[PDB]
Amino acid sequence: NNKFAVSTISDYTEKINNVKDEEVDDLIKNINKYNYDLFNGTAENQLPDYLNIHEGDVLGYIEIPSINIKLPIYYGTSVDILKKGVGVLEGTSLPVGGENTHSVLSAHTGLANQKLFTDIDKLKDGDVFYLHILKKDLAYKVNQIKVVHPDEIDELKISDDKDYVTLLTCYPYGINTERLLVRGERTDLS
Incomplete structure (x- = not known):
């Protein structure tokens, strides 16, 4: 179905695989500074x-085994990128x-015309997802599922002493009047 995405993941891997260790290190340091500054x-x-990192850059991909998801992750969520x-x-x-981090990954299947994060409505507490981002392998485990209105924002905030990634899809399917949030907590050791 999603020809363009699959090709995107391939490109990203080749391309990160050929960036010099030093440069990757220095990029992760600057991201780490940003996140701290942002907190x-x-x-x-x-x-x-x-x-x-501009709007539209690809940072890596996400895998969710239980629901057969493997997708690129862009920075930014303007309508052209969510398409x-x-x-x-x-x-x-x-x-x-x-x-003290909390990344939110937003999916809009109404714009994308692709399932994307639609099936995160089948995830439950304990299910796992993996991020592959600038050579880092990260693992998260779901610990909070919530449906929320499109300008409600509280459960997206950074929590002290926590390492969270929230998966966000418009909801319900085809209607897109809410956001379903699926929060995972880092399961690798700190």
Whole structure:
């Protein structure tokens, strides 16, 4: 179905696989700084210039085995990027992990015309998903499922001492009048 996505994941892997260790290290450091700054209210409302992560860049992919999901993750959630796939929500942590982080990954199947995160409505507490982001392998386990209105925002905030990623899909299917949130907590050791 999703020709463009599959090709996207391939591109990303080849391309990250050929970036110099040093450069990957220095990029992760700058993301790590951003997330800390963001938890501390000192970020501005756009990524800092030197990350050279723009709206539309692909950062890696997500796998959810129990529901056969493997999708690229873009930065940003403007309508043109959500037409392509899952996007990191602006003002949330970039999904590299760490205490005091919470990345939100937004999927809109009404725009995308692809299932994307539709089946996250079958996940339950304890189910697992994996992120593959700038050479990091991260694992999360679901611990909160909630349906929420499109401008409700509280359960998307960073929690002190926690490493969270929320999966967000418009909901119910075909109607897109709410957001279903599926929050996972880091299951790798810190």
